[PDB]
Amino acid sequence: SKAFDLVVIGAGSGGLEAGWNAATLYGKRVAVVDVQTSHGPPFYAALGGTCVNVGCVPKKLMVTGAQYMDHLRESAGFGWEFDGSSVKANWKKLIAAKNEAVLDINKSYEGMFNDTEGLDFFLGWGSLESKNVVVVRETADPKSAVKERLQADHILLATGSWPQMPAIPGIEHCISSNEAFYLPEPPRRVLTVGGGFISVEFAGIFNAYKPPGGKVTLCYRNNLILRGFDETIREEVTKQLTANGIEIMTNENPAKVSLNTDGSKHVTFESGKTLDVDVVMMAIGRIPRTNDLQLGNVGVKLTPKGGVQVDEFSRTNVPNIYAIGDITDRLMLTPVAINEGAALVDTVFGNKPRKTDHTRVASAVFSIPPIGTCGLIEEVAAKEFEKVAVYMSSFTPLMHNISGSKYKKFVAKIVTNHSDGTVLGVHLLGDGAPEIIQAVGVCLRLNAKISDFYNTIGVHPTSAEELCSMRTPSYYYVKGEKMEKLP
Amino acid sequence: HMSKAFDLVVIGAGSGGLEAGWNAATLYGKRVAVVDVQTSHGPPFYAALGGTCVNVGCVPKKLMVTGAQYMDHLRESAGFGWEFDGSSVKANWKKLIAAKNEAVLDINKSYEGMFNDTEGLDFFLGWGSLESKNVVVVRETADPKSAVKERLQADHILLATGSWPQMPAIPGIEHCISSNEAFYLPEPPRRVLTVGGGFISVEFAGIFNAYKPPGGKVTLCYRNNLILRGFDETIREEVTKQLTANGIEIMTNENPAKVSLNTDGSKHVTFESGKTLDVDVVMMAIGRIPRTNDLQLGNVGVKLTPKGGVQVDEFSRTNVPNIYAIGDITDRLMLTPVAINEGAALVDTVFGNKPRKTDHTRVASAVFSIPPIGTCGLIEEVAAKEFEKVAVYMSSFTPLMHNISGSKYKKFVAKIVTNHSDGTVLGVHLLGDGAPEIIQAVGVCLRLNAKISDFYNTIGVHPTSAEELCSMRTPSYYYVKGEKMEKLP
Ligand SMILES: Cc1cc2nc3c(=O)[nH]c(=O)nc-3n(C[C@H](O)[C@H](O)[C@H](O)COP(=O)(O)OP(=O)(O)OC[C@H]3O[C@@H](n4cnc5c(N)ncnc54)[C@H](O)[C@@H]3O)c2cc1C
Ligand SMILES: Cc1cc2nc3c(=O)[nH]c(=O)nc-3n(C[C@H](O)[C@H](O)[C@H](O)COP(=O)(O)OP(=O)(O)OC[C@H]3O[C@@H](n4cnc5c(N)ncnc54)[C@H](O)[C@@H]3O)c2cc1C
Ligand SMILES: CC(=O)N1CCC(C(N)=O)CC1
Ligand SMILES: [Br-]
Ligand SMILES: [Br-]
Ligand SMILES: [Br-]
Ligand SMILES: [Br-]
Numbered sequence: 024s025k026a027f028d029l030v031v032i033g034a035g036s037g038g039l040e041a042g043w044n045a046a047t048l049y050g051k052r053v054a055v056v057d058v059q060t061s062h063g064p065p066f067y068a069a070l071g072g073t074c075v076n077v078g079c080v081p082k083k084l085m086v087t088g089a090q091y092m093d094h095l096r097e098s099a100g101f102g103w104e105f106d107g108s109s110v111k112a113n114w115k116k117l118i119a120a121k122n123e124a125v126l127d128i129n130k131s132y133e134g135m136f137n138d139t140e141g142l143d144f145f146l147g148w149g150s151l152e153s154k155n156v157v158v159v160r161e162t163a164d165p166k167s168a169v170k171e172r173l174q175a176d177h178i179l180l181a182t183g184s185w186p187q188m189p190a191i192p193g194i195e196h197c198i199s200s201n202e203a204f205y206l207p208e209p210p211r212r213v214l215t216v217g218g219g220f221i222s223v224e225f226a227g228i229f230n231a232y233k234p235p236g237g238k239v240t241l242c243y244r245n246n247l248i249l250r251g252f253d254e255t256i257r258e259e260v261t262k263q264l265t266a267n268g269i270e271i272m273t274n275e276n277p278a279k280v281s282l283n284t285d286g287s288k289h290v291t292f293e294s295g296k297t298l299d300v301d302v303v304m305m306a307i308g309r310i311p312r313t314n315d316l317q318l319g320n321v322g323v324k325l326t327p328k329g330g331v332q333v334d335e336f337s338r339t340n341v342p343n344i345y346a347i348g349d350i351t352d353r354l355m356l357t358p359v360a361i362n363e364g365a366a367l368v369d370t371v372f373g374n375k376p377r378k379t380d381h382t383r384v385a386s387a388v389f390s391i392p393p394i395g396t397c398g399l400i401e402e403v404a405a406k407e408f409e410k411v412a413v414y415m416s417s418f419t420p421l422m423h424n425i426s427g428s429k430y431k432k433f434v435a436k437i438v439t440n441h442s443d444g445t446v447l448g449v450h451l452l453g454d455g456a457p458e459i460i461q462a463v464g465v466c467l468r469l470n471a472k473i474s475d476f477y478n479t480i481g482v483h484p485t486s487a488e489e490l491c492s493m494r495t496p497s498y499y500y501v502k503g504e505k506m507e508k509l510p
Numbered sequence: 511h512m513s514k515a516f517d518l519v520v521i522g523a524g525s526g527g528l529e530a531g532w533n534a535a536t537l538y539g540k541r542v543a544v545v546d547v548q549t550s551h552g553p554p555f556y557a558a559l560g561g562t563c564v565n566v567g568c569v570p571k572k573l574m575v576t577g578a579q580y581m582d583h584l585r586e587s588a589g590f591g592w593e594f595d596g597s598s599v600k601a602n603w604k605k606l607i608a609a610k611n612e613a614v615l616d617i618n619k620s621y622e623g624m625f626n627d628t629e630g631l632d633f634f635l636g637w638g639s640l641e642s643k644n645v646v647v648v649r650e651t652a653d654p655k656s657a658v659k660e661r662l663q664a665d666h667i668l669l670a671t672g673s674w675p676q677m678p679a680i681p682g683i684e685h686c687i688s689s690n691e692a693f694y695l696p697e698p699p700r701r702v703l704t705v706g707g708g709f710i711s712v713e714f715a716g717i718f719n720a721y722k723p724p725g726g727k728v729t730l731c732y733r734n735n736l737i738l739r740g741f742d743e744t745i746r747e748e749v750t751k752q753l754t755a756n757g758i759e760i761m762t763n764e765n766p767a768k769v770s771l772n773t774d775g776s777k778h779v780t781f782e783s784g785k786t787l788d789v790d791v792v793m794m795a796i797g798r799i800p801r802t803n804d805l806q807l808g809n810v811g812v813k814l815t816p817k818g819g820v821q822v823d824e825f826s827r828t829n830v831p832n833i834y835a836i837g838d839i840t841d842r843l844m845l846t847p848v849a850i851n852e853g854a855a856l857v858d859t860v861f862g863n864k865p866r867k868t869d870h871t872r873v874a875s876a877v878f879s880i881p882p883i884g885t886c887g888l889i890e891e892v893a894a895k896e897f898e899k900v901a902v903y904m905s906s907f908t909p910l911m912h913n914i915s916g917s918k919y920k921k922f923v924a925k926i927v928t929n930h931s932d933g934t935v936l937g938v939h940l941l942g943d944g945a946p947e948i949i950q951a952v953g954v955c956l957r958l959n960a961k962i963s964d965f966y967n968t969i970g971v972h973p974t975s976a977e978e979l980c981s982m983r984t985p986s987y988y989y990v991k992g993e994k995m996e997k998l999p
Contacts, residue, residue: 083973087911088590094583101577102605106598113591120589120914358970385971422576425609458944461976462951465968469958479954481847482874484572487950
């Protein structure tokens with residue numbers, strides 16, 4: 024048995040920020056628990072968290088790899104010549120390079136623990152034994168052997184989320200993004216199930232690395248993918264994915280999956296349609312990872328959707344027990360989890376309470392081409408404000424008229440409170456959009472108005488200067504109804 | 511044949527002149543004439559309708575840098591598993607130039623159609639000069655004795671003729687070219703010397719390096735010790751290293767003394783130091799000077815500054831009440847979006863009853879080197895002269911994807927310079943892929959007087975290079991009454 028100021032269950036984005044800050048900034052004694060020291064099967068996430076091991080970091084490397092399919096083709100318009108029939112995409116090399124980069128990060132976190140006073144790492148499965156006792160066991164089974172018993176003044180729940188799998192016959196013949204990161208071969212025919220960012224991003228990855236004759240299909244149960252993003256951009260990215268050979272099946276949903284004699288999968292949709300693929304990747308959602316924590320031993324309250332309930336300062340209903348990150352089922356983003364962990368420790372162990380601001384958070388989708396966004400979409404703004412203006416610019420950049428990818432329209436939209444010009448949201452689609460949007464997030468913390476953008480001098484030639492060239496609204500929402508002119 | 515009369519006559523149909531002319535005609539209903547020497551790009555006069563940026567400037571050079579970037583993309587793709595016949599790769603310069611020419615000509619034609627269509631906005635072809643306070647003469651050539659094509663009466667006259675490459679007076683200067691000719695070379699040079707340490711020399715060095723034929727070599731020379739004066743010093747040193755790492759030879763503290771032709775027709779350059787270099791093309795990019803000579807400004811008494819630009823006040827007014835000047839002719843910041851801003855402000859002031867002056871501080875700009883620069887605001891040595899305590903926040907590292915691509919020399923640099931007394935951000939300086947795109951919204955931030963805490967409180971977008979700007983809370987070092995030091999005393 025060992026005594027600690029803070030015990031953190033989950034060595035992830037938020038948990039590591041909280042633990043490191045508690046130990047090095049405030050001199051506290053910190054223990055952090057995770058189930059695996061490095062990435063991959065059997066538990067996939069590990070020391071460093073989901074983003075490091077099976078999330079943002081490896082997927083961004085794989086999207087970068089997939090972008091070379093476009094670069095090799097597009098180089099021709101600028102005079103580059105080579106033998107196109109010799110091009111091939113080696114998925115094994117990609118996965119090996121990705122594996123080496125993730126493992127390097129795993130090892131560096133190991134050394135961080137070894138090198139930092141008052142910051143200890145424990146391997147195993149943590150759960151709540153009592154209000155001030157965290158127990159670490161060998162497996163997720165609550166009857167497996169006890170490895171440690173950790174007394175704690177404060178307990179932080181930071182176990183993240185896990186892929187949601189629908190209750191359909193044959194769901195056991197499907198995979199999630201966890202397994203996609205380790206496929207021995209690139210699938211020739213693949214169905215990605217879901218309309219959200221993970222399904223869209225992997226669709227682009229598989230599309231570039233598929234062997235000859237391959238086909239990527241994405242299905243989504245409603246009418247338009249990427250719910251929660253700007254509607255113009257949802258339509259345009261649909262169009263540009265299709266232009267690059269991905270088939271988008273909307274208003275369709277798998278009803279069952281069965282095994283074929285050759286090892287492929289036979290998917291039957293609710294509509295009666297069928298599709299044979301080598302791999303079915305379910306990406307319909309991610310759910311808080313609460314079941315192994317034994318929250319019933321202490322009475323930590325969950326919300327109806329399954330997150331741990333928290334106030335604005337990440338406090339549960341049980342004194343001295345806190346939760347941050349994906350387990351609170353709010354914004355599932357790594358920098359938000361980091362921010363929450365830092366605010367929590369500043370509040371508990373420092374002299375100043377701090378709460379995370381969950382509005383105006385910039386984020387991205389690494390689709391091909393990608394999305395960058397910050398703030399409100401226009402239909403959410405129209406329910407909160409009487410007069411909303413939308414400024415819109417959409418065109419194919421000159422370079423893609425030369426590259427031959429004329430379908431690659433760049434979209435830039437600014438949403439304002441028209442009563443005073445305040446910028447409520449900015450939404451971008453096109454090369455560079457995730458990089459352009461970061462400083463827009465800073466603008467929204469300075470109560471920037473549309474005139475502040477238009478009066479700034481542009482950098483030329485860029486896509487970003489479009490944001491400083493919009494003077495006149497394209498249309499409006501008045502009392503919630505869309506219209507081209509004001510009344 | 512009768513002279514024609516206008517509210518405003520613009521000499522030069524470029525970045526600033528077209529903005530002023532279009533806004534005067536379409537926003538305020540004024541009658542406008544605009545004069546330029548050529549209706550589409552290229553020899554003999556190079557610039558034309560649309561200006562220097564459209565014809566032999568930002569627009570074509572960015573397309574050519576984009577073309578040059580594919581040399582890096584093709585090599586870097588292997589680390590991510592891409593395989594193809596490397597021996598078959600060829601860079602076809604003629605196809606690049608043909609594609610660029612067709613793009614620029616399309617812009618030329620669209621501007622031509624704007625004038626043919628738009629009420630109160632007329633274009634006149636020829637050389638404009640000042641005859642008197644209210645008369646612009648349009649002649650067939652730059653020679654003031656050449657034939658008169660038109661006389662344009664004007665209540666207000668806007669000088670917007672831009673700038674021109676400067677050529678040093680050395681023996682053999684006739685064997686050298688400028689950036690104007692570089693845009694039209696029939697074949698890519700095997701060996702080329704670019705002379706100058708500024709952005710045009712650096713950018714063209716990158717272009718020639720990608721399209722050079724087998725066994726070629728690009729050399730850049732600069733007369734002082736470190737290229738890219740005026741930019742952040744950490745970035746100046748890193749750009750030098752990363753150009754060198756991509757095979758460009760950088761000769762600093764060197765300057766051509768003379769050029770002669772070898773018997774085979776190549777250029778033999780002798781430097782002041784006595785070093786020699788044999789190249790196929792010498793491109794001079796040592797500076798650009800305002801185009802005032804042909805305007806006959808003596809006829810009306812428009813004052814020039816010692817340096818040679820048209821003298822203007824904050825509202826672009828010359829010493830002659832109804833004559834104005836904007837853009838490169840004022841010999842200040844030579845950027846297309848500054849000329850456009852000045853032209854819009856002038857027209858709002860003169861015809862719009864809403865006075866406004868251009869802010870020449872905190873202007874974001876870029877260098878499309880490979881990899882590129884994005885910057886806005888003060889460099890730290892300048893800030894240290896104006897502020898008692900200056901803080902510098904700095905992040906520099908090779909991004910993970912270039913540890914896989916093999917281009918490990920590609921360190922991304924992000925620096926924020928502050929007034930440490932109150933946290934105000936004085937400048938932001940970036941080197942690396944995406945830097946020109948990242949810096950645009952930084953310019954909006956600085957115009958809103960952002961402090962370092964506004965950057966740090968903003969939640970990052972992950973994974974990006976840009977999020978480094980929102981993760982810096984502790985200064986790397988300081989300047990205290992001008993003195994650099996790791997810690998405050
Ligand atoms: C494919 C994919 C791509 C993504 N891309 C992005 C992106 O580009 N940008 C972005 O911002 N976000 C992205 N995310 C989301 C991001 O990964 C999460 O928001 C973030 O990792 C959550 O941080 P956290 O601290 O809540 O938990 P995590 O980082 O998930 O860490 C939780 C840790 O808890 C451990 N654990 C779980 N249960 C126990 C237990 N009982 N005992 C001990 N340890 C336990 C796990 O092994 C894991 O390491 C992506 C997610 C996925 C799945
Ligand atoms: C190689 C190069 C690259 C550049 N890259 C960039 C970049 O990336 N970004 C950026 O912001 N800036 C860039 N610039 C600078 C930009 O081109 C200028 O700042 C901008 O064009 C200046 O606009 P202006 O209105 O002053 O003049 P210009 O745009 O030069 O227009 C002046 C016009 O006047 C005409 N003219 C001249 N004399 C007469 C006369 N007597 N009668 C009639 N017409 C006349 C000319 O033909 C010309 O069309 C670059 C410049 C060069 C040379
Ligand atoms: C995945 C998704 O629906 N997103 C859109 C809304 C974003 C936000 N800041 O609320 C987060 C990303
Ligand atoms: Br779905
Ligand atoms: Br929908
Ligand atoms: Br060629
Ligand atoms: Br701060």
